[PDB]
Design a protein around this ligand. Structure first.
Ligand SMILES: [Ca+2]
Ligand SMILES: [Zn+2]
Ligand SMILES: [Zn+2]
Length: 160
């Protein structure tokens, strides 16, 4: 039921099922026929918490081409962790990646790369094997288990 305003690829550097870091990297492509305000772009990654501990979010790198100038939006990305009510199998929470009001505009046919990760404050191990959006992907690939919303409506992927 995705609008196809954007296409999205994913990879997590093929992280181990048991890991103290969850990686989530997206290559988002504007396939609608007009600029898109990065402010309107949300990305979601569904998982099972396994333990209720404080998490820390990191955006390692984010950037895109605007005309012929390369724009580094790394510092403009934010991450949020919210519950999935009601909880479904392999999904009781989800990471929501967003960008600040002035991130910029993604030009028609343009691409933005967003590399993120998160971990518990105590670095204990997660069990990614019971995470809905999890799959060991070492290179970008079309993975339909993550979602992208534009302006509040699903544009790519699915939700549990
Ligand atoms: Ca889990
Ligand atoms: Zn919480
Ligand atoms: Zn919670």
């Amino acid at each position: 039921a995705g609008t196809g305003v954007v296409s999205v690829q994913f990879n997590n550097g093929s992280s181990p099922a048991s890991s103290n870091s969850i990686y989530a990297r997206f290559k988002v492509t504007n396939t609608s026929g007009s600029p898109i305000n990065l402010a309107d772009l949300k990305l979601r990654y569904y998982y099972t918490q396994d333990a209720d501990k404080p998490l820390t979010f990191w955006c390692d790198h984010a950037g895109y081409m605007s005309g012929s100038n390369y724009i580094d939006a790394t510092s403009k990305v934010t991450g949020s962790f919210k519950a999935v009510s009601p909880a479904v199998t392999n999904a009781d929470h989800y990471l929501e990646v967003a960008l600040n009001s002035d991130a910029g505009s993604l030009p028609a046919g343009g691409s933005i790369e967003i590399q993120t990760r998160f971990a518990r404050n105590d670095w204990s191990n997660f069990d990614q094997s019971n995470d809905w959006s999890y799959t060991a992907a070492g290179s970008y690939m079309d993975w339909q288990k993550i979602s992208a919303f534009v302006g509040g409506t699903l544009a790519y992927g699915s939700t549990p």
